[PDB]
Ligand binder design. Structure first.
Ligand SMILES: CC(C)Oc1nc2nn([C@]34CO[C@](C)(C3)C4)cc2cc1C(=O)Nc1cccn([C@H]2C[C@H]2F)c1=O
Length: 282
């Protein structure tokens, strides 16, 4: 447990400037802003939450799922702070930031090699598999919620939407990653698989999941382009790599394609996805 005074103190008073300019801001999600902190001889990440105020519930839920789900491919939650002006979650610092940022080479980081893209996709599937085995649905699988430590091990983060077939009157998620049935209110782990297909296309292409100036705007729509023979896989392979063999890139694309089936019951389950990603680099 942490106090707002101490989290405030170790974040330079929640300095909103980017790290490069001298502040503490590392990024921001839909629901908060993430700051670097240095507390008790340890670098940490501190998310200050910031949707109706009752919609506090997320803070509450994030703590319960972290208690249950601990795994090599899941971010570790260090502590929290409910006292003070805002609420705050403290996590183990992830030295290579998010997969989203490393795919865009944000702040000058080197492009991820194909070999490391392959290991990261396997690691992220392992984290999803752990969640579904423990009867959890993440509901916000995306490359911004896959973080990378100093070994480039993938760790799933941001459990504020996770849940323990069923409809909800409160649809949540990130639209550019969301399966059709999840957009329409369904709660199923089959939807996490769909979102993971989009993440696999980010990893293949280096492109963001949505781009209003791009044709097509939604990355998941390049699957139909390739199927229609309007483009090839090769047209979309990230050029910022020189170790991407054709065979294994097409193999991961095929995985991404099966994940992106419109009909949830035609999608592979996470165990099949794990097996196929394993076979890719075997
Ligand atoms: C993605 C962004 C928000 O976080 C980070 N960006 C970073 N960039 N760099 C560098 C180093 O060299 C560079 C050139 C790349 C800058 C290091 C980073 C560490 C973090 C971090 O540890 N971030 C989280 C840890 C734990 C959890 N969560 C999420 C729940 C939310 F809080 C995190 O976000």
């Amino acid at each position: 447990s942490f106090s707002f005074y101490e989290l405030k103190n170790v974040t330079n008073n929640f300095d909103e400037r980017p790290i490069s300019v001298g502040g503490n801001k590392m990024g921001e999600g839909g629901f908060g802003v993430v700051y670097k902190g240095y507390v008790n001889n340890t670098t940490v990440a501190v998310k200050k939450l910031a949707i109706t105020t009752e919609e506090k519930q997320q803070f509450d839920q994030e703590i319960k799922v972290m208690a249950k789900c601990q795994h090599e491919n899941l971010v570790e939650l260090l502590g929290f702070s409910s006292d003070g002006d805002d609420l705050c979650l403290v996590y183990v610092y992830m030295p290579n930031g998010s997969l989203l940022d490393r795919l865009s080479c944000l702040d000058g980081t080197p492009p991820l090699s194909w070999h490391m893209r392959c290991k990261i996709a396997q690691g992220a599937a392992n984290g999803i598999n752990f969640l579904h085995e423990n009867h959890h649905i993440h509901r916000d699988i995306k490359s911004a919620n896959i973080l990378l430590d100093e070994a480039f091990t993938a760790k799933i983060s941001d459990f504020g939407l996770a849940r323990a077939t069923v409809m909800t009157s409160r649809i949540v998620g990130t639209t550019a990653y969301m399966a059709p049935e999840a957009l329409r209110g369904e709660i199923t782990p089959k939807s996490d698989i769909y979102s993971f297909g989009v993440v696999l296309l980010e990893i293949i292409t280096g492109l963001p999941a949505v781009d209003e100036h791009r044709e097509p705007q939604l990355l998941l729509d390049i699957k139909e382009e390739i199927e229609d023979e309007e483009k090839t896989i090769e047209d979309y392979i990230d050029k910022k790599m020189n170790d991407a063999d054709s065979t294994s890139v097409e193999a991961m694309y095929s995985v991404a394609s099966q994940c992106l089936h419109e009909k949830k019951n035609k999608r592979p389950d996470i165990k099949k996805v794990q097996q196929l990603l394993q076979e890719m680099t075997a």
